[PDB]
Design a protein around this ligand. Structure first.
Ligand SMILES: CCCCCCCCCCCCCCCCCC(=O)OC[C@H](COP(=O)([O-])OCC(O)COP(=O)([O-])OC[C@@H](COC(=O)CCCCCCCCCCCCCCCCC)OC(=O)CCCCCCCCCCCCCCCCC)OC(=O)CCCCCCCCCCCCCCCCC
Ligand SMILES: CCCCCCCCCCCCCCCCCC(=O)OC[C@H](COP(=O)([O-])OCC(O)COP(=O)([O-])OC[C@@H](COC(=O)CCCCCCCCCCCCCCCCC)OC(=O)CCCCCCCCCCCCCCCCC)OC(=O)CCCCCCCCCCCCCCCCC
Ligand SMILES: CCCCCCCCCCCCCCCCCC(=O)OC[C@H](COP(=O)([O-])OCC(O)COP(=O)([O-])OC[C@@H](COC(=O)CCCCCCCCCCCCCCCCC)OC(=O)CCCCCCCCCCCCCCCCC)OC(=O)CCCCCCCCCCCCCCCCC
Ligand SMILES: CCCCCCCCCCCCCCCCCC(=O)OC[C@H](COP(=O)([O-])OCC(O)COP(=O)([O-])OC[C@@H](COC(=O)CCCCCCCCCCCCCCCCC)OC(=O)CCCCCCCCCCCCCCCCC)OC(=O)CCCCCCCCCCCCCCCCC
Ligand SMILES: CCCCCCCCCCCCCCCCC[C@@H](O)O[C@H](CO[C@H](O)CCCCCCCCCCCCCCC)COP(=O)(O)OCC[N+](C)(C)C
Ligand SMILES: CCCCCCCCCCCCCCCCC[C@@H](O)O[C@H](CO[C@H](O)CCCCCCCCCCCCCCC)COP(=O)(O)OCC[N+](C)(C)C
Ligand SMILES: CCCCCCCC/C=C\CCCCCCCC(=O)OC[C@H](COP(=O)(O)OCCN)OC(=O)CCCCCCC/C=C\CCCCCCCC
Ligand SMILES: CCCCCCCC/C=C\CCCCCCCC(=O)O[C@H](COC(=O)CCCCCCC/C=C/CCCCCCCC)COP(=O)(O)OCCN
Lengths: 69, 53, 140, 56, 55, 98, 347, 459, 121
């Protein structure tokens, strides 16, 4: 029965080790992502939560019929 | 929500009227043209969150 | 506005039961006034006098409920020497619930109202202690 | 005789085929979790001169 | 007394009664825009005084 | 904020309150809508004139245009209401109660 | 009404919504709303009767008041900052006015009163348009200015919408009013997550639109506007009633159906913030919507109601015009949860 | 483990493409083959689980439940194929589809390796059951039974979803292995109190706990026989599986939060057991006995000792088999006389002797006759409770005596005495019914031959 | 909100150029197979609604259904993968550029940490 239908204990052992590593990495990544999101939303210095500001290419830099603009 | 078709095509459908410092006819300046241009140049490219403070 | 909630909260939990009762009855009167306004707007009373009667009835019921709640909760907290505990709030809420039953002249409403109000009052106290937010500020 | 009985009882192979496919898919799935094959502290062993993997 | 009356009364029967009462209260409107827009005015005043003051 | 600005905003608030209260006639409500348009036009014109926003000067004009559209729409609807009842009373518009 | 004129009016409604969506100027967004309303008023009145005139008048009055408040908020924002661009909305009073105007346009409580009546007063095609396409522009504007959303006001209106939709749907026998109340509850769910994540808002909007389109096309296939007229459908189109039952279960929010995906995600999002009490209340309140969906399912699919003799004649005739995208909309409305991660393609 | 999941998804199209008169044969044959295949999961390790993939895993607690589910589907088919004879082929295929979907959802539920997927399938099980009850039930109370079942479940299950997403955000994962290895104590806080309540109450309702049990008599009485079998045998044990999986994170709050529920489970044990003494309806009697047994299992899980856990697993399996058999036995009489009243058809031992011995064996197993696995589970739970508190023996012994009393009462009422005179439509028992009874009862004794297979991971 | 404004983003691209630096989803990806299954279900429902033999009414239109669903799903999967890759890239860069906010704590063994023991009895 063991030879025909089943494998050794090492296979399940090491598959469990690999699975545990993957899930632990995922958990640490989720916590890190939550912290990064909190910091980016609080500060606004990262690539995220960059709300638009007015384009400075729209400004007209020409004499305006009045020296003081 | 916002589909920025104008920016994709470079069309300028309504951007000419959005601000006081953008190409008025006969180069007539707004009352607060200098303050507005200073604010826009200061706040350009840093995002609303940073630009508020 | 929310300044009524401030006048209620700025008083310590187990001190000045009269001032706490006054703040609670102010909050109750405000809530009853809003409810009366909406009831008059949506269900007209067919006459001015009946409208003022309905407004006064609702406002008095709400003010009495608030006053009884505040007075009973403050007295329980001060007598038991145990502030920062939701039993005082639960007791006040149940007493407030009883007042509603007496105002509407119904034992079921009174009994039903007392359990629900008491539970609600206790939950609010626990939220104050722990720091639960009904309207969480966007943080992430 | 074969045609009619086959068109009648071809449904009797769906479940055996499903089981075979499930066995193959399980093999494919557990061939993706070999990051620790022959690397565990309890089962680290020297490979035989003829074999290449401790388990498949 | 317990299974057919009180355990029934507390959880499902009270829930059904309260939900039906609130449904009747909410749904049964006169259909007249006069009362609706009166409610809209009341809502606008409440929102302006309450939420807007606490900026 | 100058006092004229306050008066214009008070006019808008009065027109909005007048619209949100219905007496009997739909024409009176349409008049309150037109008053809200008028107050918005005056407010926009004053703001655009005080701060010399040159390109914004067409903005009130466009506003007026759509004002007419709303008015037109309302008037059309009012005709139909009258044709169904002979009066423009808002109390007749209660079929969708049930 | 002429087919060319109907096409032109539908195209004008869609162009107004697109103009609201693609504009960076407040005046252009206002003009898009105006054009949308102007072209929408006759579409509700395509089939002329006193009820349609009533619904059109009520819709016009509500949307005109909302437009007035919208323009006033825009002008106040311009006064306190000479900016026409749709952005953070520097003034709080103007922000409250804008939020209330958009809520009135969407139908959020307590501005909900017009939705059931307007939906009941118009045909099923106009109701489909009103309950699906008319929700895009106000939601787009709300998404763009979510940074200045007062969480208290918006969340209060959203919870009120969910409660009112759930309670109001319990009392309804007509199908159009049931759809209207479900729409109000779904709008509350959509706007509850708005201050936290607009991607969740867009996901909920897409799922809701798919489910609503499926429901309305099923109700058009089986020409039923009341509970008892829908009770007859099993004797002519049993498959239609079975599909309708599965769609109703999906709208009830039961897993593993598609309608579970939005609320699930929304709950998770509010739990990334603190926000624990609100999602719990919203779930226990969506229980009411599930209840009256299940009541409809009992009447239409899980029991066989008595029929009439003339129905036999209907057994001899097929459907002349078949609505395309109905099978696709049913499938997307039921069997889509396993593809949940694809929402990452929405931000 | 896809070698079991895929064959059920293949049961689906095979059923939908089989010809009109061979749906039952094909479904039965291939369901039995699938159960034979699933029997290979009983070879469990001694230290950790069988982690097949990143999404599915099996330990010695879920393997007997999977075997019970796969074995129960053919019994449900055999018992259903009698009262659906006049049904059209399409609706018969629809009924078989409902049963197949239920079994597939249960199979994935018992082996989901993370809590959100487990929740999704645990709730997905509701739809096929509700459709079965409210579409193929017989009386007009089936609609109310379905409503009670659905809303009782969802009211307790939605806060579980909120708590689960909260836990995932706070800790970072919901995988059972990571959850167990990284477990931390819960502090005595109001927030922790409500988190405990949210995590526990869904499974409390699914047992059901005494007080929240009013859906079970309605649902189990109004349902068709297959619905009753799946409700009593498997769907009641989802609560126990979830409880014994989620209690690993609720310590040490449980030590003082279990105090109310324990009381409700102990005294309630008596109350429901007394109700069976005065039941005029056979199906309601069986349902209330199920409630009392599940109360015992709740006590076992709440006191949280290794002997209690072994007893809970054994009792869950034993009750599943026994309650399924009892429901089938009652249904045979129902199809005979079309009435559920117990005193209507009396003295059936004279007319149906072999069915009478099936009744006797089922009743003997129900009242925990040694050395059945029913007694093994009950006795292990009783010893664990006695270790917990020596005063519990009073309540447990009271329950044992009342259980024997109502079991033998039902047996004597239905089988003994004299036959009702006017009832003349009692035909001889069919081969199908006797085979169904034998296939229910033989696994029970074969299992008491080798009990370590149903004693759980704590063995 | 979070990703709508990101520097160097073309508005309506749906697939930026840098997305080609990622492995394309395999044609046997189970999500693609599920999209094909959804197309098949849509085809069967179409057959059933128009009162046609469900399994074997229109094979050409069923094939069009399946291929359309697979076609759309391929690009949907590509965009989803790209957006997740972007999220990970931005998070890692933000962690790297703000070291004081993500400090590596001292590693302690269970022989030194004192956990309170709660007996079960
Ligand atoms: C800290 C805060 C304190 C608590 C605040 C939150 C809790 C609020 C509780 C209020 C409950 C709402 C409804 C009340 C009962 C129903 C109405 C009614 O008829 O009552 C009669 C009922 C018995 O009379 P009845 O003749 O037998 O009933 C008539 C028939 O049954 C049938 O009568 P009917 O058919 O004529 O019904 C009336 C009519 C009219 O309907 C109403 O009455 C609506 C009233 C709901 C308003 C909610 C008030 C909350 C205000 C919060 C802010 C407070 C500021 C301070 O109903 C309708 O036509 C449709 C109703 C639904 C349609 C939409 C209406 C919703 C409007 C929006 C809600 C509020 C919006 C706010 C702003 C929104 C902007 C974003 O009870 C009363 O006598 C009135 C008193 C009610 C008890 C109030 C308890 C107050 C306790 C305060 C203690 C504080 C202690 C200190 C704390 C620290
Ligand atoms: C920028 C954003 C802001 C925008 C908004 C700004 C708003 C401010 C500007 C406003 C300028 C106004 C200029 C013209 C307005 C147009 C009015 C109109 O067209 O009338 C149509 C409308 C329809 O008339 P109709 O159809 O031709 O005649 C048929 C009958 O009217 C009806 O037939 P029936 O006789 O058969 O019906 C029975 C009888 C039934 O009559 C009644 O039942 C009413 C009696 C209620 C008693 C009031 C409470 C008494 C005690 C409260 C004490 C306060 C606190 C004290 C301490 C605690 C006390 C215990 O009549 C009614 O149904 C009337 C109900 C409606 C009453 C007025 C509605 C106003 C809002 C709802 C108030 C609800 C009051 C409850 C408590 C509220 C909180 C204090 O006329 C009326 O509604 C009647 C009164 C109108 C005259 C007064 C108008 C002034 C109100 C303006 C806003 C409220 C104050 C704002 C101040 C803000 C601070 C600066
Ligand atoms: C989960 C497992 C299973 C659990 C589920 C099942 C159990 C729970 C549910 C069942 C019990 C809950 C029932 C709720 C109340 C029902 C009333 C109702 O629905 O109204 C409609 C119903 C009919 O509506 P209606 O038309 O307005 O009334 C017409 C009447 O027919 C016309 O009536 P009448 O004209 O002939 O006379 C009326 C008048 C005259 O009264 C009477 O007629 C007869 C007297 C009845 C009440 C007075 C008590 C006398 C006997 C008690 C003596 C001590 C007992 C032992 C306690 C110490 C233990 C060592 O009534 C009163 O004024 C009574 C005032 C209330 C004073 C009682 C305060 C007791 C508080 C509890 C203290 C102990 C807690 C346990 C702590 C244990 C710690 C180890 O009202 C009634 O008929 C009943 C009213 C009497 C109230 C009885 C309440 C006492 C029972 C204890 C309740 C505690 C359980 C819940 C805790 C939270 C509650 C605040
Ligand atoms: C999770 C794992 C996978 C599961 C995924 C989900 C389930 C599968 C996908 C679902 C969608 C697929 C098809 C949908 C349209 C079908 C509708 C239909 O009526 O079908 C009729 C049709 C038979 O009718 P017919 O032959 O045309 O002539 C008879 C007349 O049509 C006679 O017509 P009639 O007018 O007399 O019929 C009247 C009848 C008609 O009523 C119905 O048939 C119900 C329609 C189903 C609703 C589907 C909605 C969308 C799907 C949602 C599913 C939710 C799943 C989640 C769990 C919650 C469950 C609700 O209505 C009634 O009598 C009232 C009964 C009320 C019961 C209420 C329950 C209804 C809802 C049940 C939904 C559960 C899913 C069912 C799936 C299978 C159903 C066919 O069924 C089929 O033949 C199709 C079966 C599948 C074909 C597969 C064959 C492919 C080749 C086999 C080999 C495989 C590969 C080979 C390679 C290996 C190497 C060798
Ligand atoms: C039909 C059956 C359904 C199932 C029933 C389930 C029952 C759930 C009840 C759970 C029991 C525990 C809940 C509260 C834990 C402590 C008990 C209470 O007495 O608190 C005391 C405190 O005194 C007061 O009782 C405080 C609570 C007062 C308000 C609660 C009364 C609610 C009435 C019961 C309602 C019935 C439940 C059903 C609701 C629908 C303890 O004193 P203290 O050591 O300092 O606090 C310990 C907890 N700390 C450390 C986190 C602070
Ligand atoms: C139940 C399923 C409902 C889905 C609804 C219909 C499904 C088909 C969708 C049709 C696809 C074509 C739409 C767009 C293709 C080309 C246009 C392209 O440029 O759009 C860009 C990107 O395309 C769209 O944005 C994404 C559309 C993808 C829709 C699929 C996600 C469905 C949600 C997950 C449920 C799982 C469903 C599985 C498939 C059925 C827009 O970029 P951007 O200018 O920056 O967006 C501005 C607005 N934002 C930032 C706020 C988002
Ligand atoms: C805040 C809001 C919280 C909302 C809580 C939602 C509870 C979910 C269940 C809602 C069921 C409401 C049913 C209802 O309102 O109608 C009562 C209904 C009216 O019958 P109709 O079919 O509508 O009319 C036919 C005759 N003409 O009466 C009945 O028949 C009852 C049958 C169904 C009742 C089942 C309810 C079971 C409740 C179980 C517990 C759920 C509690 C939820 C909250 C948890 C406790 C804190
Ligand atoms: C068949 C009917 C069954 C009814 C079951 C329904 C009730 C189940 C018990 C209540 C579940 C609500 C729990 C909410 C989700 C848990 C998440 C959690 O615990 O997080 C807490 C949040 O805890 C809460 O906020 C809980 C608030 C509860 C509000 C909902 C009230 C529901 C009714 C309460 C009384 C009834 C409960 C028991 C009833 C049993 C059924 C009879 C920590 O959050 P933070 O804000 O960050 O605090 C730490 C930092 N300061």
């Amino acid at each position: 029965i063991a030879r025909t239908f089943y494998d050794g204990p090492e296979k399940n052992y090491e598959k469990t080790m690999a699975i545990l590593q993957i899930e632990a990495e995922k958990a640490e990544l989720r916590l890190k992502e939550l912290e990064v999101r909190r910091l980016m939303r609080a500060r606004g210095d990262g690539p995220w939560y960059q709300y638009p500001t007015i384009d400075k290419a729209l400004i007209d830099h020409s004499p305006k019929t009045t020296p003081d603009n | 929500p916002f589909f920025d078709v104008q920016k994709r095509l470079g069309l300028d459908l309504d951007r000419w009227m959005t601000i006081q410092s953008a190409e008025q006819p006969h180069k007539i300046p707004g009352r607060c043209h200098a303050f507005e241009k200073e604010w826009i140049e200061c706040a350009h490219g840093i995002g609303g969150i940073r630009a508020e403070k | 506005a929310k300044t009524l909630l401030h006048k209620y909260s700025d008083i310590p939990e187990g001190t000045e039961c009269h001032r706490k009762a006054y703040a609670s009855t102010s909050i109750g009167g405000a809530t009853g006034l809003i409810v009366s306004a909406y009831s008059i707007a949506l269900k007209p009373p067919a006459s001015f006098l009946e409208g003022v009667a309905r407004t006064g009835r609702y406002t008095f019921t709400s003010a009495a409920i608030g006053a009884i709640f505040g007075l009973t909760s403050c007295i329980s907290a001060q007598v038991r020497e145990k502030p920062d505990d939701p039993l005082n709030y639960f007791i006040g809420g149940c007493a407030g619930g009883l007042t509603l039953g007496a105002r509407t002249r119904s034992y079921g409403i009174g009994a039903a109202a007392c359990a629900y109000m008491g539970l609600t009052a206790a939950l609010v106290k626990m939220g104050q202690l722990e720091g639960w937010q009904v309207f969480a500020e966007p943080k992430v | 005789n074969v045609l009619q009985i086959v068109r009648d009882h071809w449904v009797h192979i769906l479940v055996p085929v499903g089981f075979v496919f499930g066995c193959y898919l399980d093999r494919r799935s557990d061939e993706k979790l070999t990051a620790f094959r022959n690397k565990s502290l309890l089962f680290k062993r020297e490979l035989r001169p003829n074999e290449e993997v401790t388990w498949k | 007394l317990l299974d057919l009356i009180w355990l029934e009364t507390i959880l499902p029967k009270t829930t059904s009664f309260i939900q039906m009462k609130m449904s009747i209260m909410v749904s049964n409107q006169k259909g007249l825009i006069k009362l609706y827009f009166l409610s809209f005015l009341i809502t606008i005043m409440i929102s302006m005084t309450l939420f807007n003051y606490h900026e | 904020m100058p006092l004229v600005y306050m008066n214009i905003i008070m006019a808008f608030a009065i027109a909005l309150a007048g619209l949100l209260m219905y007496r009997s006639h739909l024409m009176s409500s349409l008049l309150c809508l037109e008053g809200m348009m008028l107050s918005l036009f005056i407010m926009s014109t004053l703001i655009i004139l005080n701060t010399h926003f040159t390109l914004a000067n067409m903005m009130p004009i466009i506003l007026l245009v759509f004002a007419a559209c709303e008015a037109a729409l309302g008037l059309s609807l009012l005709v139909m209401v009258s044709n169904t009842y002979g009066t423009d009373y808002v109390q007749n518009l209660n079929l969708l109660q049930c | 009404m002429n087919p060319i004129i109907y096409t032109t009016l539908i195209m004008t409604v869609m162009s107004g919504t697109m103009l609201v969506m693609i504009s960076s100027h407040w005046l252009l967004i206002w003009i898009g709303f105006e054009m949308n309303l102007l072209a929408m008023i006759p579409v509700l009145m395509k089939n002329f009767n006193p009820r349609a005139t009533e619904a059109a008048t009520k819709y016009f009055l509500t949307q005109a008041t909302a437009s007035m408040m919208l323009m006033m908020a825009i002008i106040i924002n311009l006064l306190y900052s000479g900016q026409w661009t749709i952005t953070k909305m520097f003034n709080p009073v103007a922000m409250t006015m804008m939020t209330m105007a958009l809520a009135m346009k969407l139908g959020l409580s307590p501005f909900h009163f017009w939705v059931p009546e307007v939906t009941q007063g118009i045909s099923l095609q106009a109701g489909l348009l009103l309950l699906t396409w008319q929700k895009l522009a106000p939601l787009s504007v709300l998404c763009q200015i979510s940074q200045s959303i007062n969480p208290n006001l918006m969340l209060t209106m959203a919870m009120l919408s969910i409660l009112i939709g759930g309670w109001g749907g319990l009392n309804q026998t007509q199908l159009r009013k049931i759809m209207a109340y479900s729409s109000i509850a779904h709008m509350g769910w959509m706007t509850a997550v708005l201050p936290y994540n607009t991607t969740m808002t867009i996901l909920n909007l897409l799922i809701y639109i798919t489910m609503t389109l499926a429901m309305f096309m099923l109700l058009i296939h089986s020409s039923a506007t009341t509970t008892l007229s829908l009770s007859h459908t099993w004797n002519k189109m049993p498959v239609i009633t079975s599909l309708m039952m599965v769609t109703l279960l999906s709208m009830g929010g039961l897993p593993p159906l598609s309608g579970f995906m939005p609320k699930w995600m929304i709950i998770q999002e509010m739990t990334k913030n603190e926000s624990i009490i609100m999602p719990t209340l919203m779930a226990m309140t969506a229980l009411l919507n599930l209840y009256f969906y299940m009541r409809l399912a009992y009447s239409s699919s899980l029991t066989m109601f008595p029929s009439t003799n003339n129905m036999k004649m209907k057994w001899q005739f097929e459907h002349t015009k078949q609505m395309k995208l109905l099978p696709t909309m049913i499938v997307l409305s039921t069997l889509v949860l396993p593809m949940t991660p694809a929402l990452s393609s929405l931000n | 483990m896809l070698k079991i999941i895929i064959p059920t998804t293949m049961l689906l199209p095979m059923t939908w493409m089989s010809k009109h008169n061979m749906i039952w044969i094909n479904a039965t044959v291939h369901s039995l083959l699938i159960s034979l295949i699933s029997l290979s999961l009983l070879n469990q390790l001694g230290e950790n689980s069988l982690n097949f993939s990143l999404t599915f895993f099996s330990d010695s607690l879920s393997a007997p439940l999977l075997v019970l589910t796969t074995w129960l589907l053919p019994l449900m088919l055999m018992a259903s194929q009698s009262h659906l004879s006049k049904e059209t082929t399409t609706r018969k295929k629809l009924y078989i589809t409902m049963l197949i979907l239920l079994q597939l959802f249960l199979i994935m539920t018992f082996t989901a390796t993370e809590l959100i997927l487990f929740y999704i399938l645990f709730e997905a099980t509701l739809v096929p059951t509700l459709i079965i009850i409210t579409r193929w039930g017989n009386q007009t109370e089936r609609l109310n039974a379905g409503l009670y079942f659905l809303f009782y479940t969802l009211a307790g299950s939605l806060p579980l979803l909120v708590a689960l997403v909260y836990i995932q955000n706070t800790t970072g994962s919901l995988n059972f292995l990571i959850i167990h290895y990284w477990s931390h104590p819960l502090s005595n806080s109001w927030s922790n109190i409500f988190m405990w309540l949210a995590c526990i109450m869904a499974f409390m309702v699914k047992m059901p706990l005494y007080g929240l049990h009013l859906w079970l008599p309605k649902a189990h009485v109004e349902a068709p026989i297959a619905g009753s079998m799946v409700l009593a045998a498997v769907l009641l044990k989802l609560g126990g599986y979830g409880m014994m999986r989620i209690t690993t994170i609720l310590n040490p709050l449980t030590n003082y939060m279990a105090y109310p529920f324990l009381m409700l489970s102990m005294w309630g044990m008596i109350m429901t057991s007394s109700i069976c003494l005065r039941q005029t309806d056979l199906k309601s009697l069986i349902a209330y006995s199920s409630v009392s047994h599940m109360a015992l299992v709740i006590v076992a899980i709440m006191i949280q000792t290794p002997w209690s856990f072994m007893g809970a697993t054994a009792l869950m399996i034993a009750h599943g088999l026994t309650s399924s058999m009892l429901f089938c036995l009652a249904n045979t009489n129902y199809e005979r006389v079309h009435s559920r009243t117990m005193i209507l058809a009396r003295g059936l031992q004279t007319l149906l002797p072999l069915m009478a011995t099936w009744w006797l064996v089922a009743s003997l197993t129900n009242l925990a006759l040694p050395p059945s696995i029913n007694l093994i589970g009950e006795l292990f739970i009783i010893t664990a409770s006695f270790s917990w508190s020596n005063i519990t023996i009073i309540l447990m012994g009271m329950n044992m005596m009342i259980t024997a009393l109502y079991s033998l009462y039902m047996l004597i009422t239905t089988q003994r005495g004299k036959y009702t005179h006017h009832i003349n439509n009692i035909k001889p028992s069919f081969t199908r019914e006797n085979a169904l009874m034998a296939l229910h009862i033989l696994p029970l004794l074969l299992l008491t031959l080798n009990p370590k297979m149903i004693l759980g991971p704590l063995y | 909100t979070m990703m709508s404004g990101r520097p160097g983003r073309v508005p309506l691209q749906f697939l930026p150029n840098e997305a080609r630096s990622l492995p394309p989803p395999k044609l046997t990806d189970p999500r693609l197979v599920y999209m094909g299954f959804l197309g098949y279900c849509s085809g069967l429902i179409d057959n059933a609604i128009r009162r046609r033999p469900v399994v074997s009414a229109g094979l050409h239109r069923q094939l069009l259904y399946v291929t359309s669903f697979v076609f759309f799903g391929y690009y949907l999967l590509k965009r989803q993968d790209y957006m997740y890759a972007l999220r990970d890239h931005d998070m890692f860069a933000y962690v790297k550029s703000h070291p004081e906010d993500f400090p590596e704590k001292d590693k302690k063994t269970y022989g030194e940490i004192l956990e309170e023991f709660h007996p079960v009895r």
